[PDB]
Amino acid sequence: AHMNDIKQLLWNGELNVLVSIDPSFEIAVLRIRVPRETYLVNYMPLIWNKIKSYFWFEHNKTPIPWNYPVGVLFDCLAGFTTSFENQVKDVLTFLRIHLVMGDSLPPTIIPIASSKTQAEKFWFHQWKQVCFILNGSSKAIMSLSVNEARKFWGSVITRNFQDFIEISNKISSSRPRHIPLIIQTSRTTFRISQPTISMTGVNPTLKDIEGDILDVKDVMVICQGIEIPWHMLLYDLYSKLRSFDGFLYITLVP
């Protein structure tokens, strides 16, 4: 009952996003709501529509990838203990990103293809890999019907929680062989790591993998925008706070 509640709360995740438009293109500064569990490019059509008056996104002059869940980007671009109740009055939590245009594409990020097919294909192939990690093969996801594969992604676009849960569970590993975990530092020196954590014969706690987390370089473990106790079980953590792309993301913050 609680895993469902937890997942619903994650699906409801939503952020105030300030989209600063590059003069080169209140139309200069868009204010939109974007869920944590989705990609920024899924909202490009909404951004273009508003400004009927290459390109990529940037945070504080640094190009940002689009292939990470918005919530994950937020965790590493916005640098918690403070409850809403004890929070100073009227603190505005938001993400400011810039839509810029240029002659040459920034070298470190996958370019935005603006084809409406790019995001879905990437995301689906990635779940195929997450399935490989969890089960040892992509059988479960490849066994989905064509209708189901399309509806799986459709749920991300329309926010259909029921469909996303039905399909993500179908393909989700009874007991993972390994945990699909990604550890990263703040993007404001950036380090990212995908450690190999086996579940065979063990039941690791966050503290148990302290070695891996620390290899990425006094630090607070943030997952889904919240602090996680070092004694929580990895599997539990993954099964509950993994993002809409199948990966569990941990962000290290001071």
């Binding site: 609680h2 895993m3 709360l9 995740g13 939503e14 204010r31 809403f84 603190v91 505005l92 919240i226």
Partner: peptide, 24 residues
């Protein structure tokens, strides 16, 4: 309960992130 802790923290997160959403 660990889940009660997560439920509580996620609700708070969503509340903080939703504050002043009328400006967006």
């Amino acid at each position: 309960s660990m889940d009660d802790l997560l439920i509580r923290r996620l609700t708070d997160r969503n509340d903080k992130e939703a504050h002043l959403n009328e400006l967006f």
